[PDB]
Write a protein that binds this DNA or RNA. Structure first.
Ligand code: MG
Ligand code: MG
Ligand code: MG
Ligand code: MG
Ligand code: MG
Ligand code: MG
Ligand code: MG
Ligand code: MG
Ligand code: MG
Ligand code: MG
Ligand code: MG
Ligand code: MG
Ligand code: MG
Ligand code: MG
Ligand code: MG
Ligand code: MG
Ligand code: MG
Ligand code: MG
Ligand code: MG
Ligand code: MG
Lengths: 152, 117, 70
RNA sequence: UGAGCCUUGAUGUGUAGGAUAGGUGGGAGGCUUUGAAGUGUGGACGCCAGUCUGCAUGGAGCCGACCUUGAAAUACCACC
RNA sequence: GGCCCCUUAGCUCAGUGGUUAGAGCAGGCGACUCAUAAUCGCUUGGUCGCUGGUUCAAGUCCAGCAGGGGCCACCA
RNA sequence: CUUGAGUCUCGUAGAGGGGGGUAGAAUUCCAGGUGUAGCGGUGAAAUGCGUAGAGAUCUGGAGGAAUACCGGUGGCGAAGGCGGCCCCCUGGACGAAGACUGACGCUCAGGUGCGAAAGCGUGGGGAGCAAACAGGAUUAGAUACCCUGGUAGUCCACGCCGUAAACGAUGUCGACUUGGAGGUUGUGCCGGCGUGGCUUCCGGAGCUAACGCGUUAAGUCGACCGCCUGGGGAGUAC
């Protein structure tokens, strides 16, 4: 906004794991205000991923999340009346938000029998650089790399 | 191919492009590179980043002579006047002299007319 | 703009002093000026305008001294 | 500064792989202080993995096939 | 009559006999912009004329027959 | 008769004018060496140039036009105008002390002369720039603005033409009338104190419809000249 006044809203960690990050993930997955359904789906998919990978629910999720976070992005700036696309550096909170949004949207557009199974498959495939989320991250990175002469 | 150990880097930086050439002390060229040949067309061609990329490619291409020292002669008003020198220094060469050699008439001829944009 | 790198100094200081020597020599100003043709009448008019603006600025700066803002 | 032939030495790493592999071949005994395993000085070529080569020290071994390849020892060798 | 050059994806063109079939052109989906044109990213797309035989391995070997061009021949 | 006007003697500053000679930087072109795949241009492109060797870089030569820095509301000229350096011919302006002539003055209808740039005639020269013209773009169209080329012309000698926002939009000559801050150029006395010429900015009385001018007047007066009389038709027709 015009005045730079806004604050920040707190969040409450999930019950069975005590991590706010899974709470934000559930929030992004939620539709129509129905939080219980989202938590059911998240817990089922995450435990399936845990028993397939064999380590745990938390660190498997974090390892999958690490392979999607972007590092540079493209914005637009003016110098003499003309607008150029320019690479900029993203902040960690923005990194987490972008990664979660990409994972959820990639998972929604699949062809399995349930949303939990879709999300489990997407996370498992992303934990080793295979999913469409990884492809989109690579696309963004190379698009930023192309417009490198305009930075600074 | 033939050891020289001394060279002169000539930089030609106009408003649209930049050309760097390496010559022996006697003016004999050994290699060259341009910003337009490195994969930069149009507007991107006239940025300091392209100039440093071209400078490092020229340093790459002139390696077969064992060049150890350099002196720099810059002409032109273009953007790539000083990033080229930094790239040449970062390429490992030893810099000895820097000189401006841009031509100035002492009156001369008549320039073109103003563009009415 | 003749620069000789002296004994035992880093590259950045030599670059900076070369830049200041070339800025002193007024090279880029000349390259900018001799780009196109300017009629004698245009040059005389611009010189008069510059002199008038200098005088007005000096008078305003001097005049601001007597007054107080609050 | 070309072309032709005559003169020798290098030269060519599919996968596999002791292996930077053209065939053939009298073929498996030659080389051996007519300075050898393994060092140091040192040059060359090199898909830069490694081969060739001058000297010195050392001073005298490698040794065929012997086992993965279809192939081996230029261990001596004629042919291109 | 004699040389020569021109078929490889949809076209034009590179392709070395060892584990290669590549490039340039359209359409499509995106990115930047309040919004266009300009730029930028990702894409859709091979019977290498039919047949032959040589190697461990035949797109790369020639063999049988194609369509038009550039010079030169020719006294039923 | 000497106070207006003029002559003589000594110095000062100056892109004032006409003619000849000469230097250094840069652009273009010609010949050669190295070297190799782009250059150039634009908001983005294309036309154009290049593997028949370009652009970049070094050496040698040819030719034309203009004089960076000094450089400045600095200087000179009736106005138009005048800028590298050296010599030859030549016009004006100002200051200090004195001598000489004796009203020899001011203004001027017709008349005469000078007068930017473009343009016309004859003979030369031609680097760069660039009306006309050709091509590439942009656009609904683009006889344009932008890009790539380019001929008259721009240069010299001699001769015409006679016009410009030729402007300070302010005719020439003389006398009188509070101040302040600077620039440039002479001179007197001992950095200070005076005294002449030209010039930039502000401002008082006064004047003006107002804006503004204000000792360089658009203030107070005198001599002579030129011009105006509602807007179009028209600065046109005969
Ligand atoms: Mg020019
Ligand atoms: Mg231009
Ligand atoms: Mg008179
Ligand atoms: Mg008259
Ligand atoms: Mg004229
Ligand atoms: Mg004429
Ligand atoms: Mg003529
Ligand atoms: Mg015509
Ligand atoms: Mg033009
Ligand atoms: Mg006239
Ligand atoms: Mg008139
Ligand atoms: Mg008038
Ligand atoms: Mg008069
Ligand atoms: Mg009045
Ligand atoms: Mg006033
Ligand atoms: Mg007064
Ligand atoms: Mg009066
Ligand atoms: Mg009046
Ligand atoms: Mg009337
Ligand atoms: Mg008339």
């Amino acid at each position: 906004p015009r005045r730079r006044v806004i604050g920040q809203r707190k969040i409450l960690p999930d019950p069975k794991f005590g991590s706010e990050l899974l709470a934000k993930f559930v929030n992004i997955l939620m539709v129509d205000g129905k939080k219980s359904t989202a938590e059911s789906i998240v817990y089922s998919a995450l435990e399936t991923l845990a028993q397939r990978s064999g380590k745990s629910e938390l660190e498997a999720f974090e390892v999958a999340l690490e392979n999607v976070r972007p590092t540079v992005e493209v914005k637009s700036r003016r110098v003499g009346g003309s607008t150029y696309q320019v690479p900029v550096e993203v902040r960690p909170v923005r990194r987490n938000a972008l990664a979660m949004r990409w994972i959820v949207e990639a998972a929604r557009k699949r062809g399995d029998k349930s949303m939990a199974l879709r999300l489990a498959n997407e996370l498992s495939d992303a934990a080793e650089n295979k999913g469409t989320a990884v492809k989109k991250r690579e696309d963004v990175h190379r698009m930023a790399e192309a417009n490198k002469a305009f930075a600074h | 191919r033939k050891q020289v150990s001394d060279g002169v880097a000539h930089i030609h930086a106009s408003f649209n492009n930049t050309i760097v050439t390496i010559t022996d002390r006697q003016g004999n060229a050994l290699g060259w590179a341009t910003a337009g040949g490195s994969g930069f067309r149009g507007s991107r061609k006239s940025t300091p980043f392209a100039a440093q990329v071209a400078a490092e490619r020229c340093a790459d291409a002139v390696k077969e002579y064992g060049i150890k020292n350099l002196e720099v002669m810059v002409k032109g008003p273009g953007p790539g006047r000083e990033s080229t020198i930094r790239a040449l220094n970062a390429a490992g060469f030893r810099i000895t002299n820097i000189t401006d050699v841009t031509p100035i008439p002492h009156x001369g001829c008549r320039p073109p007319k103003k563009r009415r944009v | 703009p003749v620069i000789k790198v002296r004994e035992n100094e880093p590259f950045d200081v030599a670059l900076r002093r070369f830049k200041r020597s070339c800025e002193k020599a007024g090279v880029l100003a000349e390259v900018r000026r001799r780009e196109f043709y300017e009629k004698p009448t245009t040059e005389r008019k611009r010189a008069k305008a510059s002199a008038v603006k200098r005088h007005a600025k000096k008078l305003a700066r001097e005049n601001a001294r007597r007054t107080r803002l609050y």
